[PDB]
Design brief:
Chains A, B: Belongs to the methyltransferase superfamily. RlmI family. Chains A, B: It comes from Escherichia coli (strain K12). Chains A, B: GO terms for molecular function: protein homodimerization activity; RNA binding; rRNA (cytosine) methyltransferase activity; rRNA (cytosine-C5-)-methyltransferase activity. Chains A, B: Its EC number is 2.1.1.191. The structure is a homodimer of 395-residue chains. By secondary structure, chain A is an alpha/beta fold. The first copy, chain A, has three domains: 1-71, PUA domain (Archaeosine Trna-guanine Transglycosylase, Chain: A, domain 4, Roll), CATH 2.30.130; 72-180, RNA methyltransferase domain (HRMD) like (Transcription Regulator spoIIAA), CATH 3.30.750.80; 181-394, Rossmann fold, CATH 3.40.50.150. Chain A contains eleven helices and 21 strands. The first copy, chain A, has a seven-stranded mixed beta sheet, sandwiched between helices. In chain A, strands 2-6-5-4-1-3 form a six-stranded mixed beta sheet. In chain A, a hairpin with a 2-residue loop joins strand 12 and strand 13 (189-193). Chain A is globular. The A-B interface holds A 16-17, 84, 87-88, 91, 95, 108, 110, 216, 219, 331, 349, 352-353, 356-357, 362-368, 370, 373, 376-380, 382, 385, 392-393, 395 and B 16-17, 84, 87-88, 91, 95, 108, 110, 216, 330-331, 349, 352-353, 356-357, 362-368, 370, 373, 376-380, 382, 385, 392-393, 395.
């Protein structure tokens, strides 16, 4: 019904099949549409370009559902998209021994604003854009048809929804309520996730390969895992045969789950330590007395200057990575990460390089990490790559 | 005791410990030094900053040997550098099942302009810069001392030398002459290398992880290996249990070695096809008749449009990757690479994305490749990262 007319020239992004239409590229709206309503997007002359979801409260005024002129956005549309995404995850599950994975990664699976993670028999939703919420009913119907035995839970309690003009929301959608802790599997390893209250959708599936890579580096080595959360990296270190792994986190609850994870995998508790403390404080205490480690995993949360898209300068990263380098033996390996929207892979690299200079030690980049394969990045949406990380060796 | 004086406020690079000192930064040469000779680098006030090698014919007027005031560059200097580098490769070889690897990766192992590859009991040199050649005797002494039972061969037939004011050179140094083909091991796989007349030093050790990843995607799938050369990818595909692997190359010699690698590993020859033909032609032939593959490996030769870092701007990568995408079905995977300093990782990504649009299909980036860990990149030398690659899934 309603159409969004692009300003002359401003249709280049659509021709590149980019899923987003910024408010600034819109010349006018022909007709009135509701929040999240399906609209057609045409060029300044009126030629059809795509069919998307209208988002009046957002700067991303519309997101593209499809570039096929004959494709309506209804239950069938979502069913087809789910089936296409499932084909990929079926292969990944078999190959990597997975019982859980991200099923739809928004724009990269052709469903902008929608994220769905599979955890055992639970499907966890995060409807982050206006279009996602508007199509909630259709999406659910498709999900119930394709995954009749699965329970659906909503974890749309993400601040980004405010950018789309919607309230945050979460809770059961269908089926049974998830347990406090649900065991999932990855690469012959079991991990407990909290769907109702855990981070994101319940866990960080995106760090799957970083965790697996940890196994290769830790044989008979002393490991320090900073901001360990529920200990995914700790279990991975033990699976790799580390002599000892020290997990540090500010949350006792997370550390308790970490210990439950070690026990669940029948690993050696004697080789694992769980320290509840201000990470920065612990790191300085260790450094001041000369503590040394062979492998250090560094994966901090909101860089500190979070949300500070403006006044970023969140060089809490330099301090954290500098401390890490100072705690490494010669030949020590640092696996450090960042998912902050205030920095790119290149800028993250410069920070590490700078931390090395101040620490008085040179480091070699020997590996670059990426979000797992169930978090694909469609080529038309490079911004989709958010997880940055490197494996560094102290010379 | 000749010194290279830097223009005021132009020593910031040395302060970041970057190994290169460009001509534009040189204020004046206080003294007369021969090509490759050891010299001191100072600021406008005469303060010592580093000790490097002079290269009058290059844009890179000097490369830093050391930033340690008391460190002289002699046999002991190279001996210590070789031992420090060997420490890392000993760990990598045992971990990844290697009897061959890059021992010294120039700047990244504190020896700018020097590259040394180890193939079994052979050490292959490549002295690319003025300083590398000038220090040949000292480097050789350290080597014969640390590796008394290894033969040394020189493969300094690299165009880079001309840009440093030298002529190309290659041939034996000490020990026995390498055999026509020498079998090496990596990840439980055997490959044949030609040290005397093969590409580079005799093989592409840097693609080790690319070959490994090829194994993950090919079980029960039809594979197309473009620019197979002496094999490597064809064997990897078979090691992964591919249903069929077709290798294309214009060189009958390379194809003969590819097949030899297959037999050497006792793999099913009945699943391997070797086609001698123009890769571009065969690709259009397959495209024209609707041939389809499940996985395609695309590792083009030397840029094709090299003729300088900037002489690139050639859409040969674009055209070649477009053909590949047209040869895949939904779910098909493209493993495509670039080693030319003719483009960054982001530029290569752009090309694939463009190839995708012209092909009329979307592709998902699910994995990113880089030179193997024995080809480290010191944080002070970002330009050290030259190998780029992506695993792309056709939607």
């Amino acid at each position: 019904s309603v159409r969004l007319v692009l300003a002359k020239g401003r249709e280049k992004s659509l021709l590149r099949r980019h899923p987003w239409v910024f408010s600034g590229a819109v010349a006018r709206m022909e007709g009135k549409a509701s929040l999240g309503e399906t609209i057609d997007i045409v060029d300044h002359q009126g030629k059809w370009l795509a069919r998307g979801a209208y988002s009046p409260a957002s700067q991303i005024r519309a997101r593209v559902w499809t570039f096929d002129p004959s494709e309506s956005i209804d239950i069938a549309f979502f069913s087809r998209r789910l089936q296409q995404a499932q084909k990929w995850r079926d292969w990944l599950a078999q190959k990597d021994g997975l019982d859980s994975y991200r099923l739809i990664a928004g724009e990269s699976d052709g469903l902008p604003g929608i994220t769905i993670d599979r955890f055992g028999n639970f499907l966890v939703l995060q409807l982050l854009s206006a279009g996602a919420e508007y199509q909630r009913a259709a999406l659910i119907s498709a999900l119930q048809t394709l995954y009749p035995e699965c329970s659906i839970y909503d974890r749309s309690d993400v601040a980004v929804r405010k950018k789309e003009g919607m309230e945050l929301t979460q809770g059961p959608v269908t089926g049974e309520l998830p347990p406090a802790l649900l065991p999932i599997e990855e690469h012959g390893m079991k991990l407990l996730v909290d769907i109702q209250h855990g981070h994101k959708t319940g866990y960080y599936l995106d760090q799957r390969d970083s965790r697996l890579a940890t196994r290769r580096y830790v044989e008979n080595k002393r490991v320090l895992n900073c901001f360990s959360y529920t200990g995914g990296f700790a279990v991975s270190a033990l699976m790799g045969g580390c002599s000892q792994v020290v997990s540090v986190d500010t949350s006792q609850e997370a550390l308790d789950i970490a210990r439950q994870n070690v026990e669940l995998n029948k690993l050696d508790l004697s080789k694992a330590e769980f320290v509840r403390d201000d990470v920065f404080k612990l790191l300085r205490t260790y450094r001041d007395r000369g503590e040394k480690f062979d492998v250090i995993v560094m994966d901090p949360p909101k860089f500190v200057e979070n949300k500070s898209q403006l006044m970023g300068a969140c060089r809490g990263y330099k301090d954290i990575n500098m401390l890490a380098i100072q705690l490494l033996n010669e030949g020590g390996i640092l696996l450090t990460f960042s998912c902050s929207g205030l920095m790119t892979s290149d800028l993250f690299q410069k920070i590490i390089a700078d931390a090395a200079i101040d620490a008085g030690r040179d480091v070699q980049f020997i590996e670059q990490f990426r979000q797992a394969a169930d978090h694909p990045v469609i080529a038309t949406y490079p911004e989709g790559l958010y997880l940055k990380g490197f494996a560094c060796r102290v010379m």
